[PDB]
Amino acid sequence: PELPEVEAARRAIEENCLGKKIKRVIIADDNKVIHGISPSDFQTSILGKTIISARRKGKNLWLELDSPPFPSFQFGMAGAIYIKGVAVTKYKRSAVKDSEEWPSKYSKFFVELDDGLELSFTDKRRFAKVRLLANPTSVSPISELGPDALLEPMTVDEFAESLAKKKITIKPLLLDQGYISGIGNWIADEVLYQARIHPLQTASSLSKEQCEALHTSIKEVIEKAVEVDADSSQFPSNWIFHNREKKPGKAFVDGKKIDFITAGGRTTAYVPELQKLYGKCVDKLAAALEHHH
Known part of the structure; x- marks a missing residue:
């Protein structure tokens, strides 16, 4: 839940x-x-x-x-x-x-x-x-608990300033109830896919434009799911949610392939073609190995 x-x-x-x-x-x-x-x-x-x-x-x-x-x-x-x-x-x-x-x-x-x-x-x-x-x-x-994703949304600038100090990959940060509360596995995959951010992207490496895109996608995903009282059958068809549970090889969304990346016990459904990991090579490596901490 x-x-x-x-x-x-x-x-x-x-x-x-x-x-x-x-x-x-x-x-x-x-x-x-x-x-x-x-x-x-x-x-x-x-x-x-x-x-x-x-x-x-x-x-x-x-x-x-x-x-x-x-x-x-x-x-x-x-x-x-x-x-x-x-x-x-x-x-x-x-x-x-x-x-x-x-x-x-x-x-x-x-x-x-x-x-x-x-x-x-x-x-x-x-x-x-x-x-x-x-x-x-x-x-x-x-x-x-951190501020409720629905009841206490950070403003665009508050959101960006908080992410600037977070030195961890974004997927687990979104799951951290102490940072923002209410987001779980599927909402995390959905907002990252929607905002076009890879799950291994360090939060502090996100640009101003990326933070705003993530801010916007969290808002739209949370507001829509609540608007339809969590009835997934009513979730927009263009959401990765629908095919996020299908077997590897036959999972697509809007016609694009979905892959499953698993880092430190966490599995994320994402679209490689649309969610790219950014940064210098050694930072991308550190993020991929972050689970060691």
């Missing part, structure tokens, strides 16, 4: 869960996912409270209850939000089909609300983190 998917879960929660009281709570017995608190303490703390709004920063979601502490959800690689109870919904990835077990055996956070509405956070891989904090934004991990 990257910013768009987590944001869609946030809006799905606000569609029917606001202003409703928590009548029953089930916090999973997972001392790996449920962090820093026992499930029974977690349950006792939020039972009886009303959900005022749903908030998000990067890939972290949290519920603003009528009074704190507030439950927060760090999605990890398989975290998901599911809402059952209201037949009609604008958020399909959060709907639950009758043939699905419910509550899911993967549920980590579950509450039954007024009007029989039930909300659940599930994690099949157990890489997610669920916390109950006095203020989610004051402590880790949310307090260590």
